[PDB]
Amino acid sequence: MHFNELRISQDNRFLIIDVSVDNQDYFEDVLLDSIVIDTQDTFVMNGPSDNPLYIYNVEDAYDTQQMKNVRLELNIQDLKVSPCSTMFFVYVKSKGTPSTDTPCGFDKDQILGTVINLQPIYKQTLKYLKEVECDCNIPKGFIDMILKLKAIELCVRTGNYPQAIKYWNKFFIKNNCKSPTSNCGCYG
Amino acid sequence: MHFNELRISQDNRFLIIDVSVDNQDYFEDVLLDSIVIDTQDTFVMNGPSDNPLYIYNVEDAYDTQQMKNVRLELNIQDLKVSPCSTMFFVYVKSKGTPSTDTPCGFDKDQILGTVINLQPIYKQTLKYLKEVECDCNIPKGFIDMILKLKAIELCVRTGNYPQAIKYWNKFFIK
Amino acid sequence: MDKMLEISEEAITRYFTTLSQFGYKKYSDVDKIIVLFFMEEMLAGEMSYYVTQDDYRNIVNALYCLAGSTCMIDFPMFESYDTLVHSNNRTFVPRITEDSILRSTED
């Protein structure tokens, strides 16, 4: 199993999820069970919390490739959370048994992916961007913002998620952005 | 899989490699595969490098328990390297699946063993002891040599071979 | 454009916010504000019909000297999904282990 598109729309409306089982020929019998959305405030070390933010069972739909690829486009206003000061954990639960002879560690029934809105972080980094031009001084703000982002990236891709929330709360929980205008806009 | 003796001959003419597979019951299926020799010039962290110094494939010698134990004696001059200023890295491989009852971390196909010539070090220690005999003062070069040898020991036992070669080239060659 | 208007509105609002908290802004910065809203007026009126694409290039490259110059003028953020190093999501699908005359072969 893997993630194809894990992103928040830059208009700060939609938490885009697009998961698909891996295409190898041992992964026929493995299907998708459910999608659990969780936040930094309701996180647990192992598996989803018992108080998630949103649950979506895949099998409550057409009943096979339609299962093997799923996409959610949740409106964040419905979830009653801020698109910018919120960091989401997307758990995807599998339903089935991979055929034997697979190399071990590919038969992971659960996969987890972290989501953040980088646009306000780029807004903060653009402030210190021009320090790169000036010589004779260290671009201290630019380096600080780069290290702040890289800490969260590193702590996510290593699985050290709790320290990732600690850094996120320290740094970016006070991020501000323009809330999506609920009345839709004319453009194209 | 382990080493029985990995030594350079006292005559400074052969490089002795005597490998064996461990005696425990669940390496019955496992055999010995090959012997790859690298120096301080051609080493790479990710296994043996390309264009190695000397490759050996063990089916060639024999015509199955004979294949579990191997002994080599390479004339170092035939390898076209200096026996006194060369640090050899000896890789070995298994080509065999252990049983399913193996305790975790024991199933590793590859090992490595570093080799150097102790004769120049012995001569340096003898020279420094001769210096010590005169006036009973310890030369500081002797303590530096001792501590640098210990540094290379620590680097080898921790697997930090790059800095190990850096120290070797910087101190015990030049 | 519709974005120079937003940038100018933000800039003068910040200017008068500073003049509310403080009673002083650098006139070297008021000069940049003046340049900014003069360009906003000129491009959004009857004077834009003299603008070529070379003139547009020069105008944009001159305006971006104002970008991070002060706190009032700030770097604009546009909707972009690109980068200097793009991803490779192509998949490999071999056919009947078939090498071609020289190269390998997929679907």
């Binding site: 295409n23 | 790479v44 296994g47 490098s49 390309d50 190695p52 080509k95 | 490999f92 071999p94």
Partner: peptide, 19 residues
């Protein structure tokens, strides 16, 4: 690297995996 044969068999096994 010095690839063993069995590693190559693994590679083609996993490549013909998406056959």
């Amino acid at each position: 690297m010095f690839f063993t044969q069995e590693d190559y068999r693994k590679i083609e096994k996993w490549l013909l995996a998406n056959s």
